[PDB]
Design a protein around this ligand. Structure first.
Ligand SMILES: [C][C]([C][C]/[C]=C(\[C])[C][C]/[C]=C(/[C])[C][C][C]=C([C])[C])[C][C]OP([O])(=O)OP([O])([O])=O[C]1O[C]([C][O])[C](O[C]2O[C]([C][O])[C]([O])[C]([O])[C]2[N]C([C])=O)[C]([O])[C]1[N]C([C])=O
Ligand SMILES: *[C@@H]1O[C@H](CO)[C@@H](O[C@@H]2O[C@H](CO)[C@@H](O)[C@H](O)[C@H]2NC(C)=O)[C@H](O)[C@H]1NC(C)=O
Lengths: 701, 50, 149, 110, 37, 117
């Protein structure tokens, strides 16, 4: 009876604190699997670029970082780092780092970046509970926080060591929505100002800000069509638009896109419409209805013609830029595949399958409709926005696998609402929990089993919830805990053997080559080489220049003599290629060879390169004796398979066999006229060749 | 016997347990509403006893 | 200009035109929109968009020592690859599970007959339990090591 | 006739408007005149410098919209819609928003 | 340092307990008389 | 004129226009002006087809049957558009535009003739 004597207000608050506190602990802890199993290192290719920038900003100061121009990348063109980057992620890391040192807590910058992502996941959990509470109740909010904490889809990009923009982008997005919902619901300017400020913070953090600037106009427009438009909506939306537009423009990278791009036009159009709608209502109330029709018709005819002419003129003249390639694809799926090879090339741009949805979300997929049904049943202005957020995310998540992360937040909140409704309804069905007010007479004799029905329904729901935890734990441990830079292989004895070839090659270059040497490689590895090798590179992941990449592709795909001519022009010193045949590493260059062929031929200079030439007469890509003659004599084939014919990969297979393609190389013996072997890793994962100079005697090489 | 039969006991015991629970629920649901008319007859005899 | 159109109608009988808004064309009801969304959800989770871009076969083929072409429904060992038949079959299960709860909720309403209430409950549990349990089997076949440690 | 309608509309408006509300309308007219005049200059003299023109023009619109929001919140007719908001609270928010607007336009004015 | 096996068991235990507590919160919340007052 | 004769006359005029359009389709699409000429022909086909459809409806279901926007008007417009596509894609804009302009006046003509009477 000790718990009973406490006031109910005490009981509710105490449980609320305990549930939220635990959820934060779980969110942070679950992301440490990689750091424990493997070394505390930066993961993936993109994060390294952020890591290098973060160090430069902290050591050099903000002002120097703002104007930083990097000459070590995209040689000889160069890149302007200050104006082509998003500063949000770097600024947050630097600011915390300064504070910790200020108190004499000396921590490495590398540690700060590695552990930045888990901490924010805990912050995201708190924001989720408040946003859900506003829509329905506290009970739903506690459910949402639990689901968001362990959702695998969010975990994939937020694991410890994943220093990527996505880690902070999600938290900013939820906060901005939470401010927006309060701004509309309360109708207060103060909330509107807070919402705009949060929006600006997101704009710096990520490049995905565009999604928000279109969804919010869409929500307002639907309310107008449905007749729910009110003074509160006018103040909240209009106030945010003005401050948000100016704030976003401050970022150097965004520049003038908000006012000149066709991407941001939707927000501008809705803003103009709101003024017209508000003014018309004010006139109607003051004026006599009979007269009002005469003025109303005359005004519409004159204004409508003027507005239509202005809009047509802007589009036709081309003052407003057409949509960017990246966004056009997201809408029209076919456009990217048929028109832009580079966008198709990326491996996270593929459409999503059913297996992907279940693997990332599991139970939530079952519960997503239930949340939708309740929201439709009880229509509210705040609720309308969440429906818009859901139904769009589903469409944009199928088109691209990467956008799954955007889907994960909406999925957790909506699924929680469905679970909350089911739990409350049946639980109060269980009279034992509450006698409350009951009438024995007219009790519905169509009912024999009240005690049993509720007990079974609650029990089954609990079973589903526990299973969700188990699935989420197993997937994260087995899927998202692998560092890309370090590869795990099993030995014959079954021991865990670690392959460190990727770093080993970088270290060799770092100390054993001239400082001014230029290294040529595929654009995939541009960030990694610069961060660790500290040597100049020709191409980078950002791929700001398509023509430069295409020229690189031509050299690799071409014959040995032609490739040499291109390389000399660019002052290439070394070439790095990754070969996985010995170890069975699937993601080698040879699999990526085809993309090189298409990209190389995309430009005018690469017209001579035809994809069909590299295939067998039957349309097959093979590296064996039956392979196309052009393929066997291309630069890439020679580099990967130089001296590889005589190596025994397997006891059960003849020498010169390639394990990953499961085929034996057709051309086993050949010599490199213009290239010499500089260094090869122990497992041959990375091979480095040095460019030979011209002939001393002038003989044709 | 354990390696061959245990899978079979898992497949057979689950239906048997579900039938047993269903039988319990059916028996509880089939509780017959005491006829209020017989209760009224008890009330009629109660007035004779008073 | 109007006379020119009259010239055919001098001999021909002019059609009687009533340019009124069609009666059936009403603003969609809130329930109507929800139904439309649900069907879309079925297709999107099914990977219809994946099918259009990648154009996989409905079913593939395999072989053994006994040889001969087994049809294949599940694309083994690659999470981001699917066949046409497999994607739709999985998607339907997801929709069914959601509906099972809604029908169960409606069953709880007061003033329902004894027979109606019992029958509705049976359907609700069957849809929910089968939909969830079956989905686990489908993944287990696609990835043999699923949830195995 | 439309011209007759405009005359009566002014006649009712002047009688029916409290002095404080009228002061807002006069202020709004001043804001609108400045913004329109700037816009005419840009299309006559040219876009350059784009940074200066955009920063100045946006400031006029921000001031105009902010005044309108105060004009609606304080109005008794709309008191029910903005439940729980006293006139004092509305004014304090309006000043706070204005301060932010001046600062951001300040960065991009040059 | 903790091994990965220990971390995995820890994650499972906390999650299961937390979800059950949220169910318990639902119990008290409906059971609350003042919520209906 | 008699309703039965009127139905046949409208059908004959529409049929003749369609056959001519296909026969000279290659020539019509050769030049922009010729494609515009196709637009006039397609609209005329739409007008005659609509007249025939109403006449047929009156005979089968009794005199005075009223044509609706759907499906009587929509179907006639769709058939004319389909013929336009065969010659060239470009007409679908012009061929459609002429049909709409004719439709508004034809409705104006019908209202005066029938509603006034
Ligand atoms: C995608 C994302 C976004 C999100 C959004 C959304 C979903 C929304 C949609 C829309 C809408 C409108 C909706 C609504 C509706 C209606 C109205 C109806 C984002 C993405 O991210 P990012 O950042 O991009 O990522 P990454 O990828 O990493 O990035 C990188 O990469 C890219 C590629 O992909 C690139 O790009 C580039 O850019 C440049 C600029 O400078 C240019 O020049 C080029 O061209 C390009 N390229 C390509 C290939 O595209 C980028 O840039 C990068 N990034 C950086 C930062 O740098
Ligand atoms: C990465 O390479 C750069 C490029 O040289 C190195 O920068 C040199 O640093 C040394 C030591 O401070 C200076 O004496 C040289 O003048 C620098 N050269 C240039 C061109 O700036 C840099 O030290 C290397 N990074 C390391 C070792 O971490």
């Amino acid at each position: 009876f000790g718990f009973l004597r406490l006031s109910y207000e005490k009981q509710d608050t105490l449980l609320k604190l305990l549930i939220l506190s635990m959820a934060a602990v779980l969110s942070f802890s679950t992301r440490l699997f990689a750091v424990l199993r493997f070394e505390s290192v930066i993961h993936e290719f993109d994060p390294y670029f952020n890591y290098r920038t973060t160090r430069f900003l902290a050591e050099e100061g903000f002002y120097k970082f703002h104007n930083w121009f990097d000459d070590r990348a995209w040689y000889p063109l160069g890149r302007i780092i200050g104006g082509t980057i998003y500063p949000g992620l770097m600024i947050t890391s630097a600011a915390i780092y300064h504070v910790l040192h200020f108190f004499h807590i000396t921590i490495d910058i590398r540690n700060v970046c590695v552990f930045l992502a888990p901490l924010f996941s805990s912050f995201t959990t708190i924001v989720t509970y408040h946003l859900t509470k506003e829509l329905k109740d506290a009970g739903a909010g506690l459910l949402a926080a639990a689901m968001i904490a362990v959702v695998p889809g969010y975990i994939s990009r937020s694991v410890a060591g994943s220093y990527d923009n996505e880690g902070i982008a999600i938290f900013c997005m939820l906060l901005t929505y939470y401010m927006w919902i309060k701004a509309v619901k309360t109708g207060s300017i103060c909330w509107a100002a807070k919402c705009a400020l949060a929006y600006f913070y997101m704009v710096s953090s990520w490049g995905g800000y565009v999604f928000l600037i279109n969804l919010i106009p869409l929500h307002v427009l639907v309310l107008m069509l449905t007749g729910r438009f009110s003074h509160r909506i006018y103040v909240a939306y209009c106030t945010v638009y003005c401050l948000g537009t100016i704030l976003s423009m401050q970022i150097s990278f965004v520049g003038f896109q908000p006012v000149l791009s066709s991407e941001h036009m939707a927000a501008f159009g809705v803003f103009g419409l709101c003024q017209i709608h508000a003014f018309v209502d004010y006139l109607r109330s003051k004026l006599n209805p009979q007269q009002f029709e005469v003025l109303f018709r005359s005004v519409i005819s004159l204004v409508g013609f003027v507005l239509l002419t202005v809009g047509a003129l802007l589009m036709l003249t081309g003052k407003i830029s057409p949509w960017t390639g990246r966004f056009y694809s997201l809408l029209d799926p076919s456009y990217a595949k048929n028109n832009i090879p580079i966008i198709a090339s990326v491996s996270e741009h593929q459409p999503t399958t059913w297996s992907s949805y279940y693997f990332d979300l599991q139970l939530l997929v079952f519960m997503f409709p239930v949340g939708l049904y309740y929201c439709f049943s009880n229509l509210s202005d705040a609720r309308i926005f969440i429906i818009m957020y859901g139904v769009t995310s589903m469409y944009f998540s199928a088109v691209m696998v990467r956008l799954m992360l955007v889907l994960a937040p909406v999925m957790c909140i909506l699924s929680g609402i469905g679970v909350s409704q089911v739990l409350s309804t049946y639980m109060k069905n269980l009279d034992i929990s509450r006698p409350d007010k009951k009438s024995k007479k007219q009790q519905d004799s169509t009912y024999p089993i009240k005690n049993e029905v509720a007990s079974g329904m609650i029990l089954v729901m609990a079973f589903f919830l526990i299973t969700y935890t188990f699935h989420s734990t197993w997937v994260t441990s087995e899927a998202y805990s692998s560092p890309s830079i370090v590869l795990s292989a099993r030995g014959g004895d079954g021991s865990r053997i670690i392959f460190d070839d990727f770093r080993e090659a970088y270290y060799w270059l770092r100390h054993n080559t001239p400082e001014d040497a230029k290294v040529m490689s595929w654009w995939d590895y541009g960030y990694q080489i610069t961060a660790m090798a500290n040597r100049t590179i020709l191409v980078d992941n950002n791929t700001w220049n398509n023509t430069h990449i295409s020229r690189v592709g031509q050299a690799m795909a071409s014959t040995e003599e032609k490739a040499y001519e291109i390389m000399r022009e660019l002052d290439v010193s070394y070439v790095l290629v990754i070969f996985g045949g010995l170890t069975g590493y699937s993601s080698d260059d040879i699999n990526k060879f085809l993309w090189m062929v298409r990209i190389g031929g995309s430009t005018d200079t690469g017209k001579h390169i035809k994809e069909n030439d590299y295939y067998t007469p039957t349309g097959e890509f093979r590296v064996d004796r039956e392979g196309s003659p052009v393929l066997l004599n291309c630069l890439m084939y020679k580099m990967c398979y130089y001296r590889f014919g005589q190596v025994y990969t397997e006891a059960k297979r003849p020498p010169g066999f390639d394990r990953v393609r499961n085929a034996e190389i057709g051309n086993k013996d050949f010599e490199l006229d213009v290239l010499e072997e500089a260094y090869t890793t122990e497992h041959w994962l990375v091979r480095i060749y040095k460019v030979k100079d011209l002939d001393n005697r002038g003989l044709s090489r | 016997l354990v390696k061959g039969i245990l899978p079979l006991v898992g497949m057979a015991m689950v239906p048997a347990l579900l039938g047993l629970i269903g039988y319990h629920l059916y028996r509880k649901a089939n509780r017959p509403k005491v006829s209020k008319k017989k209760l009224k007859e008890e009330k009629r005899n109660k007035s004779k006893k008073k | 200009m109007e006379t020119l159109y009259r010239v055919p109608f001098l001999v021909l009988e002019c059609p009687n035109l009533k340019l009124k808004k069609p009666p059936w064309l009403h603003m969609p009801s809130a329930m109507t929109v929800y139904a439309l969304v649900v069907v879309s959800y079925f297709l999107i989770t099914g990977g219809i968009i994946y099918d259009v871009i990648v154009e996989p076969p409905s079913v593939g083929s395999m072989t053994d020592e006994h040889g001969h072409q087994r049809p294949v429904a599940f694309l083994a060992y690659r999470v981001n690859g699917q066949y046409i038949m497999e994607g739709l079959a999985s998607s339907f299960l997801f929709t069914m599970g959601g509906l099972g709860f809604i029908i169960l909720d409606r069953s709880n309403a007061p003033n329902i007959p004894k027979l109606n209430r019992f029958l509705l409950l049976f359907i609700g549990f069957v849809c929910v339990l089968l939909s969830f349990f079956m989905a686990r089997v489908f993944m287990r076949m696609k990835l043999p090591g699923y949830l195995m440690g | 006739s439309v011209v007759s309608v405009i005359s009566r509309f002014l006649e009712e408006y002047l009688s029916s408007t409290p002095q404080r509300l009228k002061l807002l309308d006069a202020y709004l007219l001043y804001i609108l005149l400045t913004g329109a005049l700037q816009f005419g200059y840009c299309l006559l003299v040219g876009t350059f410098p784009f940074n200066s023109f955009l920063s100045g023009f946006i400031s006029c619109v921000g001031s105009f919209i902010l005044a309108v929001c105060l004009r609606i919140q304080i109005n008794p007719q709309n008191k029910a819609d903005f439940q729980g908001i006293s006139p004092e609270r509305a004014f304090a928010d309006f000043l706070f928003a204005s301060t932010i607007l001046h600062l951001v336009v300040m960065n991009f004015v040059g | 340092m903790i091994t990965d096996v220990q971390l995995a068991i820890f994650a499972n235990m906390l999650g299961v307990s937390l979800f059950l507590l949220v169910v318990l919160y639902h119990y008290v919340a409906v059971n609350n008389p003042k919520k209906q007052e | 004129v008699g309703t039965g004769t009127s139905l046949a006359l409208s059908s004959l005029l529409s049929l003749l226009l369609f056959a001519g359009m296909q026969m000279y389709s290659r020539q019509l699409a050769s030049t922009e002006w010729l494609t515009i000429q196709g637009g006039l022909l397609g609209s005329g086909l739409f007008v005659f087809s609509l007249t025939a459809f109403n006449n047929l409806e009156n005979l089968v279901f009794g005199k005075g049957f009223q044509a609706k926007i759907f499906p009587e008007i929509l179907l006639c417009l769709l058939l004319a558009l389909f013929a336009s596509g065969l010659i060239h894609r470009v007409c679908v804009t012009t061929c459609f535009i002429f049909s709409m302009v004719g439709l508004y006046y034809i409705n104006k003509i019908s209202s005066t003739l029938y509603q006034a009477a």
